[PDB]
Amino acid sequence: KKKVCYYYDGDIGNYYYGQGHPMKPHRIRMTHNLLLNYGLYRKMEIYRPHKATAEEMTKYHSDEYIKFLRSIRPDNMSEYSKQMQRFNVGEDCPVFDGLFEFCQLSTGGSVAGAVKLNRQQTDMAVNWAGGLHHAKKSEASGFCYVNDIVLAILELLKYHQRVLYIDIDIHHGDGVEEAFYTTDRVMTVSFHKYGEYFPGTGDLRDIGAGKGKYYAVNFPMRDGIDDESYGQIFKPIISKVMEMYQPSAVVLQCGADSLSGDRLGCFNLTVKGHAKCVEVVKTFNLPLLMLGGGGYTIRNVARCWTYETAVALDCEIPNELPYNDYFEYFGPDFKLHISPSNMTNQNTPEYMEKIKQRLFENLRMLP
Ligand SMILES: O=C([C@H]1C[C@@H](c2cccc(Cl)c2)CN1)N1CCN(c2nccc3ccsc23)CC1
Ligand SMILES: O=S(=O)([O-])CC[NH2+]C1CCCCC1
Ligand SMILES: [Ca+2]
Ligand code: NA
Ligand SMILES: [Zn+2]
């Protein structure tokens, strides 16, 4: 079997974005506890991430920005109000106790995973605490402070001429796209809701610039996309990307805010529909870093990432959930898998095929 390494620090669920903030790191602990109770620890290597250093983070981020994140605390915010404005910290990216440590552990898992892949010590590495795709070189954005994904891709680029990034979070992976927009050494592929929706980027027509022209791919979608519709475009697009780009490593952001029932997202994917993306990417037999992402209905985040860990291990697991420390969260049914809702799919067959056809025309422009 393909080998899987998995990163988790038992404090990650203790970082708290603040009362009423929808981002709940506790969801990572729920995920871990569920997959432990399913027995999946028997089949993979489990590591604690290191705390990523300033030196590691400044491989992408500016020194001033990282020094600020290392400095800012609830008790000294009054003294830092102008830096808070410059670095976009204090509102949707709040100041909280242990903010910097949270960044260090999230990032540590992603970079450590990348090193493992580079050293050919694993076939897949998993960091559900990562996937912070909105963070920018010198500013926080969209709940994200340090871009673990960009840092992990930079690590892979030490050994790999061509790295493929795939993002199935409901939001456009703008910070990752931006970092690599002018290079052909990373192709970014984002599927996301588009139409006056955060972050506002990821138009069909954003295809990269300079040497990077045609190395950014964006599939904009409407509310209510379902497993059938998503599956019919994901496999063909990734197949064509693989054929034309021929990457030697892949990073897959597995943001679960694209699931049905998400508190913030308006897609209608099941856990099986979402996990099909992991199965498709695995068929290409390339070194693969799987990262977390959004997701705000936390029972469904735990289900999603537990099932995707099982997919990585080629292990079926039963729909009947095992007893676990969060069992009451999974009522009323106590099953792993979720049903779609009755929401309308605004993505017509013709819309999906037309967008796919435009993306195929762009991919045919590769050498
Ligand atoms: O889901 C996300 C992003 C977060 C990202 C992620 C992944 C992993 C760990 C972490 Cl800590 C964060 C996964 N995608 N967001 C929710 C919606 N939000 C806004 N919507 C409307 C409006 C506004 C205005 C400001 S923020 C916002 C933007 C951020
Ligand atoms: O379960 S456990 O291994 O004790 C969790 C370790 N947490 C670390 C977070 C960063 C600061 C050092 C401790
Ligand atoms: Ca996306
Ligand atoms: Na690119
Ligand atoms: Zn998101």
Short mmCIF file of C-alpha atoms and ligand atoms in Angstrom, two decimals:
data_model
loop_
_atom_site.label_atom_id
_atom_site.label_comp_id
_atom_site.label_asym_id
_atom_site.label_seq_id
_atom_site.Cartn_x
_atom_site.Cartn_y
_atom_site.Cartn_z
CA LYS A 1 0.00 0.00 0.00
CA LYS A 2 0.90 3.66 -0.40
CA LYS A 3 2.33 5.12 2.83
CA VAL A 4 0.55 7.92 4.70
CA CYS A 5 2.06 10.33 7.22
CA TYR A 6 -0.31 12.53 9.26
CA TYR A 7 0.35 15.67 11.34
CA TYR A 8 -1.48 16.64 14.51
CA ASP A 9 -0.69 18.60 17.66
CA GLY A 10 -3.05 18.00 20.55
CA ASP A 11 -3.15 21.73 21.41
CA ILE A 12 -4.43 22.83 17.99
CA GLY A 13 -8.07 22.57 19.13
CA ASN A 14 -7.40 24.92 22.08
CA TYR A 15 -6.76 28.06 19.95
CA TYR A 16 -9.93 30.16 19.98
CA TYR A 17 -10.76 32.86 17.42
CA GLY A 18 -13.23 34.48 19.86
CA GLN A 19 -16.94 34.47 20.79
CA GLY A 20 -19.17 34.37 17.65
CA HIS A 21 -16.25 33.74 15.23
CA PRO A 22 -17.23 30.86 12.89
CA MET A 23 -13.68 29.42 12.61
CA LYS A 24 -13.36 26.69 15.28
CA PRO A 25 -9.93 24.95 15.48
CA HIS A 26 -11.66 22.39 17.77
CA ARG A 27 -12.99 20.81 14.56
CA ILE A 28 -9.43 19.49 13.94
CA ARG A 29 -9.47 17.74 17.35
CA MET A 30 -12.93 16.29 16.60
CA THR A 31 -11.56 14.97 13.32
CA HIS A 32 -8.54 13.43 15.07
CA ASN A 33 -10.67 11.81 17.78
CA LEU A 34 -13.07 10.31 15.27
CA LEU A 35 -10.36 8.82 13.09
CA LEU A 36 -8.57 7.42 16.20
CA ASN A 37 -11.81 5.73 17.26
CA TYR A 38 -12.18 4.27 13.79
CA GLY A 39 -8.68 2.70 14.31
CA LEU A 40 -7.04 4.52 11.38
CA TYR A 41 -3.94 5.19 13.52
CA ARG A 42 -3.03 1.49 13.01
CA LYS A 43 -2.35 2.14 9.31
CA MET A 44 -0.46 5.47 9.26
CA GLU A 45 2.46 7.29 10.82
CA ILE A 46 1.28 10.03 13.15
CA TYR A 47 3.62 12.96 13.91
CA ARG A 48 3.45 16.13 15.94
CA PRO A 49 4.41 19.11 13.82
CA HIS A 50 7.24 21.38 14.88
CA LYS A 51 6.50 25.05 15.51
CA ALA A 52 7.48 26.59 12.18
CA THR A 53 10.18 29.19 12.73
CA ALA A 54 10.33 32.82 11.58
CA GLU A 55 13.09 31.68 9.23
CA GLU A 56 10.71 29.13 7.63
CA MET A 57 7.79 31.63 7.38
CA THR A 58 9.91 34.36 5.81
CA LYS A 59 10.69 32.07 2.86
CA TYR A 60 7.49 33.73 1.58
CA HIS A 61 6.16 36.32 4.06
CA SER A 62 7.80 39.64 4.73
CA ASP A 63 10.00 39.94 7.85
CA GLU A 64 8.01 42.91 9.15
CA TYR A 65 4.71 40.99 8.87
CA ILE A 66 6.07 37.88 10.65
CA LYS A 67 7.73 40.01 13.37
CA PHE A 68 4.35 41.72 13.92
CA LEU A 69 2.48 38.36 14.23
CA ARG A 70 5.12 37.25 16.76
CA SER A 71 4.54 40.46 18.77
CA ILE A 72 0.79 41.11 18.77
CA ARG A 73 -1.26 40.02 21.81
CA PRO A 74 -4.66 40.87 23.36
CA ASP A 75 -2.89 42.86 26.13
CA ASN A 76 -0.78 45.11 23.78
CA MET A 77 -3.24 45.79 20.86
CA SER A 78 -3.63 49.41 21.97
CA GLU A 79 0.10 49.96 21.19
CA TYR A 80 -0.07 48.31 17.74
CA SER A 81 -3.19 49.88 16.19
CA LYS A 82 -1.40 51.22 13.04
CA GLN A 83 0.39 47.89 12.39
CA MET A 84 -2.93 46.09 12.94
CA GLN A 85 -4.40 48.23 10.13
CA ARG A 86 -1.36 47.69 7.83
CA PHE A 87 -1.36 43.89 8.32
CA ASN A 88 -5.21 43.51 8.35
CA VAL A 89 -5.27 41.93 11.82
CA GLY A 90 -7.93 42.73 14.47
CA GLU A 91 -11.34 42.00 12.79
CA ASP A 92 -12.15 38.85 10.76
CA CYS A 93 -8.49 37.93 11.38
CA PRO A 94 -8.71 38.63 15.11
CA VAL A 95 -5.97 38.94 17.72
CA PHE A 96 -6.19 35.94 20.09
CA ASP A 97 -4.13 34.27 22.79
CA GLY A 98 -1.54 32.01 21.10
CA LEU A 99 -2.16 33.39 17.58
CA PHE A 100 1.48 32.99 16.60
CA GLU A 101 1.74 29.42 18.02
CA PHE A 102 -1.37 28.51 16.02
CA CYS A 103 0.33 29.79 12.86
CA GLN A 104 3.50 27.86 13.78
CA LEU A 105 1.69 24.51 14.26
CA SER A 106 -0.56 24.88 11.20
CA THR A 107 2.43 25.79 9.06
CA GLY A 108 4.72 23.23 10.67
CA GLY A 109 2.51 20.34 9.60
CA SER A 110 2.44 21.47 5.97
CA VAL A 111 6.17 22.13 5.59
CA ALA A 112 7.08 18.93 7.48
CA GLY A 113 4.72 16.97 5.13
CA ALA A 114 6.42 18.50 2.11
CA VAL A 115 9.87 17.53 3.43
CA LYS A 116 8.66 13.93 3.92
CA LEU A 117 7.41 13.82 0.34
CA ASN A 118 10.71 15.34 -0.96
CA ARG A 119 12.72 12.70 0.97
CA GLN A 120 10.49 9.97 -0.58
CA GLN A 121 9.75 8.75 2.96
CA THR A 122 6.02 8.86 2.27
CA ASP A 123 3.55 8.85 -0.63
CA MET A 124 0.96 11.04 1.05
CA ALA A 125 1.21 13.53 3.87
CA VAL A 126 -1.85 14.91 5.61
CA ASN A 127 -2.20 18.15 7.64
CA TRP A 128 -5.85 18.95 8.43
CA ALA A 129 -4.69 22.04 10.43
CA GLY A 130 -3.35 23.59 7.17
CA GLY A 131 -4.89 24.89 3.95
CA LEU A 132 -4.84 28.66 4.86
CA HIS A 133 -5.14 29.75 1.23
CA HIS A 134 -6.06 33.48 1.65
CA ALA A 135 -2.95 34.68 3.54
CA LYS A 136 -0.83 37.14 1.57
CA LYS A 137 2.86 37.97 1.61
CA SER A 138 2.46 40.96 3.97
CA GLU A 139 -1.12 40.76 5.28
CA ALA A 140 -3.69 38.49 6.85
CA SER A 141 -6.92 37.79 4.96
CA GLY A 142 -10.04 35.70 5.40
CA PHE A 143 -9.19 34.24 8.83
CA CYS A 144 -5.70 33.25 7.49
CA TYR A 145 -2.40 34.70 8.78
CA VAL A 146 0.44 32.52 7.45
CA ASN A 147 0.12 30.76 4.06
CA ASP A 148 1.20 27.21 4.97
CA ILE A 149 0.28 26.13 1.43
CA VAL A 150 2.65 28.55 -0.33
CA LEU A 151 5.43 27.59 2.14
CA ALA A 152 4.82 23.87 1.49
CA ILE A 153 4.84 24.41 -2.27
CA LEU A 154 8.13 26.32 -2.00
CA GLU A 155 9.56 23.30 -0.11
CA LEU A 156 8.35 20.90 -2.90
CA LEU A 157 9.85 23.24 -5.57
CA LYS A 158 13.26 22.46 -4.18
CA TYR A 159 12.95 18.92 -5.63
CA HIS A 160 10.11 19.19 -8.18
CA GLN A 161 10.23 21.17 -11.43
CA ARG A 162 6.40 21.32 -11.66
CA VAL A 163 3.98 21.29 -8.73
CA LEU A 164 0.19 21.11 -9.12
CA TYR A 165 -2.06 22.83 -6.56
CA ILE A 166 -5.80 21.85 -6.45
CA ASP A 167 -8.31 23.70 -4.23
CA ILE A 168 -11.83 22.38 -3.54
CA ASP A 169 -12.66 24.82 -0.73
CA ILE A 170 -15.80 26.78 -1.72
CA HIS A 171 -13.60 29.96 -1.76
CA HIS A 172 -11.08 30.89 -4.43
CA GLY A 173 -7.53 30.03 -3.33
CA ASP A 174 -6.41 33.58 -4.05
CA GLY A 175 -3.26 33.79 -1.88
CA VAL A 176 -1.83 30.63 -3.44
CA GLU A 177 -2.74 31.75 -6.97
CA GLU A 178 -1.17 35.16 -6.37
CA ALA A 179 2.12 33.74 -5.02
CA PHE A 180 2.66 31.70 -8.22
CA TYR A 181 0.72 33.78 -10.78
CA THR A 182 3.83 34.63 -12.88
CA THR A 183 5.52 31.18 -12.86
CA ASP A 184 4.95 28.01 -14.83
CA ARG A 185 6.55 25.97 -12.02
CA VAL A 186 3.25 25.82 -10.13
CA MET A 187 -0.12 25.37 -11.76
CA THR A 188 -3.00 26.45 -9.50
CA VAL A 189 -6.44 24.94 -10.06
CA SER A 190 -9.34 26.32 -7.97
CA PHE A 191 -13.02 25.28 -8.08
CA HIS A 192 -15.06 27.86 -6.13
CA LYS A 193 -18.24 29.81 -5.86
CA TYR A 194 -18.04 32.98 -7.89
CA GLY A 195 -20.32 36.06 -8.13
CA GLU A 196 -19.86 38.82 -5.53
CA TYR A 197 -18.54 36.18 -3.16
CA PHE A 198 -15.42 36.23 -0.94
CA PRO A 199 -12.64 36.90 -1.93
CA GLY A 200 -13.94 38.28 -5.25
CA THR A 201 -11.21 36.74 -7.43
CA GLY A 202 -10.94 33.51 -9.49
CA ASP A 203 -12.70 34.65 -12.68
CA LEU A 204 -12.59 32.13 -15.59
CA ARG A 205 -10.47 34.73 -17.43
CA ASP A 206 -7.74 34.90 -14.73
CA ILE A 207 -5.28 32.51 -16.40
CA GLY A 208 -1.88 33.79 -15.07
CA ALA A 209 0.64 36.33 -16.43
CA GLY A 210 4.12 36.34 -17.93
CA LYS A 211 5.76 32.92 -17.87
CA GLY A 212 2.72 31.97 -15.74
CA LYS A 213 0.18 32.65 -18.55
CA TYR A 214 -2.10 29.54 -18.78
CA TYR A 215 -0.73 28.15 -15.43
CA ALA A 216 -3.65 29.42 -13.36
CA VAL A 217 -6.98 27.67 -13.78
CA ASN A 218 -10.25 28.83 -12.24
CA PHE A 219 -13.62 27.06 -12.40
CA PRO A 220 -16.30 29.48 -11.15
CA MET A 221 -19.53 27.87 -9.89
CA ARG A 222 -22.96 28.89 -8.62
CA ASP A 223 -24.88 27.82 -5.50
CA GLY A 224 -26.15 24.30 -5.10
CA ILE A 225 -23.62 22.28 -7.05
CA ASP A 226 -24.09 18.57 -6.30
CA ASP A 227 -21.95 15.42 -6.37
CA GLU A 228 -22.94 14.43 -9.91
CA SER A 229 -22.29 17.89 -11.38
CA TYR A 230 -19.00 18.35 -9.53
CA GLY A 231 -17.75 14.85 -10.39
CA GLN A 232 -18.50 15.36 -14.10
CA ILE A 233 -16.19 18.35 -14.26
CA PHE A 234 -13.48 17.57 -11.67
CA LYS A 235 -12.19 14.32 -13.20
CA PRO A 236 -12.03 15.55 -16.77
CA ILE A 237 -10.36 18.85 -15.81
CA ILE A 238 -7.75 17.27 -13.52
CA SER A 239 -7.14 14.49 -16.14
CA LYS A 240 -6.46 17.14 -18.80
CA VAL A 241 -4.26 19.17 -16.39
CA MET A 242 -2.30 16.01 -15.59
CA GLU A 243 -1.86 15.13 -19.26
CA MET A 244 -0.77 18.64 -20.35
CA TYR A 245 1.15 19.87 -17.25
CA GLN A 246 2.73 16.55 -16.11
CA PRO A 247 3.46 17.69 -12.52
CA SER A 248 5.71 15.54 -10.25
CA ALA A 249 3.96 16.48 -6.97
CA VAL A 250 0.47 17.58 -5.97
CA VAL A 251 -0.97 19.68 -3.15
CA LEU A 252 -4.74 19.28 -2.55
CA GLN A 253 -6.60 21.77 -0.33
CA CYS A 254 -9.62 19.85 0.99
CA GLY A 255 -11.69 22.72 2.43
CA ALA A 256 -14.97 21.28 3.71
CA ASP A 257 -17.02 24.49 3.39
CA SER A 258 -18.04 23.07 -0.04
CA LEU A 259 -20.25 20.47 1.77
CA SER A 260 -23.99 20.52 1.92
CA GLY A 261 -25.28 22.09 5.13
CA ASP A 262 -22.19 24.23 5.76
CA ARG A 263 -22.96 27.18 8.02
CA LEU A 264 -21.28 29.67 5.62
CA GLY A 265 -21.12 27.81 2.23
CA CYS A 266 -23.95 27.26 -0.26
CA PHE A 267 -22.81 24.13 -2.17
CA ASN A 268 -24.57 20.75 -1.92
CA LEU A 269 -21.75 18.13 -1.96
CA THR A 270 -21.83 15.04 0.23
CA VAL A 271 -18.77 13.68 1.99
CA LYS A 272 -18.58 11.00 -0.78
CA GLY A 273 -18.74 13.67 -3.51
CA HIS A 274 -16.03 15.71 -1.88
CA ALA A 275 -13.83 12.65 -1.20
CA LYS A 276 -14.15 11.55 -4.83
CA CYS A 277 -11.74 14.41 -5.54
CA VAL A 278 -9.13 12.72 -3.29
CA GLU A 279 -9.74 9.38 -5.06
CA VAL A 280 -9.26 10.98 -8.51
CA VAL A 281 -6.03 12.75 -7.54
CA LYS A 282 -4.65 9.47 -6.02
CA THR A 283 -5.12 7.59 -9.32
CA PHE A 284 -2.19 9.63 -10.77
CA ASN A 285 0.33 8.04 -8.28
CA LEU A 286 2.12 11.30 -7.55
CA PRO A 287 3.48 12.42 -4.16
CA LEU A 288 0.48 14.15 -2.55
CA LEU A 289 0.11 16.65 0.28
CA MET A 290 -3.47 16.80 1.56
CA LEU A 291 -4.37 19.90 3.57
CA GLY A 292 -7.40 21.15 5.42
CA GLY A 293 -9.34 24.34 4.74
CA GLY A 294 -12.69 25.85 5.59
CA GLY A 295 -15.78 24.21 7.04
CA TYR A 296 -18.15 25.65 9.62
CA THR A 297 -20.59 22.82 10.39
CA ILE A 298 -18.04 21.08 12.51
CA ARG A 299 -19.65 17.62 12.72
CA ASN A 300 -19.49 17.47 8.91
CA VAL A 301 -15.88 18.71 8.83
CA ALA A 302 -14.92 15.82 11.17
CA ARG A 303 -16.82 13.35 8.95
CA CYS A 304 -15.27 14.70 5.74
CA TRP A 305 -11.64 14.65 6.86
CA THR A 306 -12.03 11.31 8.65
CA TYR A 307 -13.40 9.76 5.47
CA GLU A 308 -10.69 11.42 3.33
CA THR A 309 -8.01 10.00 5.66
CA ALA A 310 -9.56 6.57 5.08
CA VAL A 311 -9.51 7.23 1.30
CA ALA A 312 -5.80 8.13 1.52
CA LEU A 313 -5.20 4.79 3.36
CA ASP A 314 -7.35 2.81 0.89
CA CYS A 315 -9.41 1.64 3.87
CA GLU A 316 -13.21 1.47 3.85
CA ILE A 317 -14.77 2.38 7.14
CA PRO A 318 -18.34 1.76 8.29
CA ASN A 319 -21.09 4.36 8.08
CA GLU A 320 -21.98 3.55 11.72
CA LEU A 321 -19.86 5.97 13.75
CA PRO A 322 -17.74 4.53 16.54
CA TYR A 323 -18.23 5.90 20.02
CA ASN A 324 -15.96 8.93 20.45
CA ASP A 325 -15.40 11.94 22.74
CA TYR A 326 -17.75 14.09 20.62
CA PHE A 327 -20.38 11.43 19.85
CA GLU A 328 -23.37 13.71 20.71
CA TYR A 329 -22.21 16.16 17.93
CA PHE A 330 -23.17 13.56 15.29
CA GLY A 331 -26.87 13.24 16.09
CA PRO A 332 -29.49 12.65 15.12
CA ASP A 333 -28.26 9.82 12.89
CA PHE A 334 -24.70 9.04 14.18
CA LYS A 335 -23.57 8.14 10.62
CA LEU A 336 -20.40 9.12 8.81
CA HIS A 337 -22.04 10.02 5.51
CA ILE A 338 -24.39 12.94 4.86
CA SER A 339 -27.37 13.44 2.56
CA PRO A 340 -27.63 16.34 0.17
CA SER A 341 -30.31 19.03 0.74
CA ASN A 342 -33.16 19.95 -1.58
CA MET A 343 -31.47 23.26 -2.57
CA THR A 344 -31.61 24.14 -6.26
CA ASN A 345 -28.48 23.50 -8.31
CA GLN A 346 -27.94 26.90 -10.11
CA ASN A 347 -25.20 25.22 -12.25
CA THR A 348 -26.98 23.97 -15.36
CA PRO A 349 -25.51 21.08 -17.39
CA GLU A 350 -24.84 23.50 -20.24
CA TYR A 351 -23.12 26.03 -17.95
CA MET A 352 -20.81 23.33 -16.54
CA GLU A 353 -19.90 21.94 -20.00
CA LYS A 354 -19.34 25.43 -21.51
CA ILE A 355 -16.96 26.45 -18.70
CA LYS A 356 -15.14 23.09 -19.01
CA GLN A 357 -14.79 23.66 -22.76
CA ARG A 358 -13.23 27.16 -22.17
CA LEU A 359 -10.77 25.60 -19.65
CA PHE A 360 -9.89 22.80 -22.13
CA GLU A 361 -9.10 25.48 -24.76
CA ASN A 362 -6.72 27.19 -22.29
CA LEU A 363 -5.06 23.91 -21.31
CA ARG A 364 -4.44 23.07 -25.00
CA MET A 365 -2.28 26.25 -25.09
CA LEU A 366 0.36 24.52 -22.88
CA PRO A 367 3.55 23.60 -24.89
O1 LIG B 1 -14.02 29.83 4.54
C1 LIG B 1 -13.33 30.85 4.50
C2 LIG B 1 -11.89 30.77 3.99
C3 LIG B 1 -10.94 30.68 5.21
C4 LIG B 1 -10.00 29.53 4.82
C5 LIG B 1 -9.27 28.84 5.96
C6 LIG B 1 -8.74 27.56 5.77
C7 LIG B 1 -8.07 26.90 6.78
C8 LIG B 1 -7.90 27.51 8.00
C9 LIG B 1 -8.41 28.77 8.20
CL1 LIG B 1 -8.20 29.54 9.75
C10 LIG B 1 -9.09 29.44 7.20
C11 LIG B 1 -10.92 28.62 4.00
N1 LIG B 1 -11.67 29.57 3.17
N2 LIG B 1 -13.81 32.04 4.89
C12 LIG B 1 -15.17 32.20 5.42
C13 LIG B 1 -15.84 33.37 4.73
N3 LIG B 1 -15.06 34.60 4.95
C14 LIG B 1 -15.68 35.79 4.62
N4 LIG B 1 -16.85 35.71 3.92
C15 LIG B 1 -17.49 36.84 3.58
C16 LIG B 1 -17.04 38.10 3.90
C17 LIG B 1 -15.84 38.22 4.63
C18 LIG B 1 -15.09 39.34 5.12
C19 LIG B 1 -13.96 38.97 5.78
S1 LIG B 1 -13.70 37.28 5.87
C20 LIG B 1 -15.16 37.03 4.99
C21 LIG B 1 -13.71 34.44 4.38
C22 LIG B 1 -12.99 33.24 4.99
O1 LIG B 2 -0.68 16.65 23.25
S1 LIG B 2 0.58 17.36 23.40
O2 LIG B 2 1.67 16.72 22.70
O3 LIG B 2 0.90 17.66 24.79
C1 LIG B 2 0.33 18.94 22.60
C2 LIG B 2 1.61 19.74 22.48
N1 LIG B 2 1.29 21.16 22.11
C3 LIG B 2 2.47 22.06 21.87
C4 LIG B 2 1.96 23.35 21.21
C5 LIG B 2 3.06 24.40 21.09
C6 LIG B 2 3.68 24.68 22.45
C7 LIG B 2 4.27 23.41 23.04
C8 LIG B 2 3.20 22.34 23.19
CA CA B 3 -11.48 26.54 -4.17
NA NA B 4 1.14 29.66 -11.83
ZN ZN B 5 -13.47 28.63 2.47
#
